[PDB]
Amino acid sequence: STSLSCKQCQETEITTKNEIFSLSLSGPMAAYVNPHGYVHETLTVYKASNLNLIGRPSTEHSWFPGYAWTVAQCKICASHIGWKFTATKKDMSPQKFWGLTRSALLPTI
Ligand SMILES: O=C1CC[C@H](N2Cc3c(ccc4c3OCC43CCNCC3)C2=O)C(=O)N1
Ligand SMILES: [Zn+2]
């Protein structure tokens, strides 16, 4: 229903609350530890748009075993919004989703 927009440029829709989903047995809203020990608050959604991808998928320090990650940035302002996760194996489900930085969106949830 509600849009989630890039907090930096404000006008740009990234996804909607009805794309919010739970992977495996995790809640949709979760915090994970980055390689330097920062606690990073994310939201998992099936679909997102107005994002560029940077770099190639990587499984290093993957918060989601089985999935690789690729940095995702706002197409308009280049602010880092989150990551695209893609499955490393063909029988996994889903094959793709997005883990977005909560604090990079508006409204903030
Ligand atoms: O599944 C997920 C999504 C990506 C998320 N990452 C990945 C990552 C984050 C921060 C810094 C870095 C990084 O890899 C590259 C690096 C570490 C080596 N030095 C350069 C910068 C970060 O937060 C993570 O740990 N897990
Ligand atoms: Zn933006």
From Swiss-Prot:
The chain holds residues 319 to 426 of 442 of the full protein. Residues 2-109 form the CULT domain. Thalidomide was widely prescribed to pregnant women in the late 1950s as a sedative and as treatment against morning sickness. Thalidomide was found to be teratogenic, causing multiple birth defects. More recently, thalidomide use has increased for the treatment of multiple myeloma and erythema nodosum leprosum, a painful complication of leprosy. Widely expressed. Highly expressed in brain. This is Protein cereblon. It is linked to Intellectual developmental disorder, autosomal recessive 2: A disorder characterized by significantly below average general intellectual functioning associated with impairments in adaptive behavior and manifested during the developmental period. MRT2 patients display mild intellectual disability with a standard IQ ranged from 50 to 70. IQ scores are lower in males than females. Developmental milestones are mildly delayed. There are no dysmorphic or autistic features. Substrate recognition component of a DCX (DDB1-CUL4-X-box) E3 protein ligase complex that mediates the ubiquitination and subsequent proteasomal degradation of target proteins, such as MEIS2, ILF2 or GLUL. Normal degradation of key regulatory proteins is required for normal limb outgrowth and expression of the fibroblast growth factor FGF8. Maintains presynaptic glutamate release and consequently cognitive functions, such as memory and learning, by negatively regulating large-conductance calcium-activated potassium (BK) channels in excitatory neurons. Zn(2+) binds at C6, C9, C74, C77. It comes from Homo sapiens. Belongs to the CRBN family. Ubiquitinated, ubiquitination is mediated by its own DCX protein ligase complex. Coiled coil: none annotated. (S)-thalidomide binds at H61, W63, W69. The CULT domain binds thalidomide and related drugs, such as pomalidomide and lenalidomide. Drug binding leads to a change in substrate specificity of the human DCX (DDB1-CUL4-X-box) E3 protein ligase complex, while no such change is observed in rodents. It is found in: Cytoplasm; Nucleus; Membrane. Interacts with KCNT1. Component of a DCX (DDB1-CUL4-X-box) protein ligase complex, at least composed of CRBN, CUL4A, DDB1 and RBX1. Interacts directly with DDB1. Interacts (in pomalidomide-bound form) with IKZF1 and IKZF3. Interacts with ILF2. Interacts with TRAF6 and ECSIT.
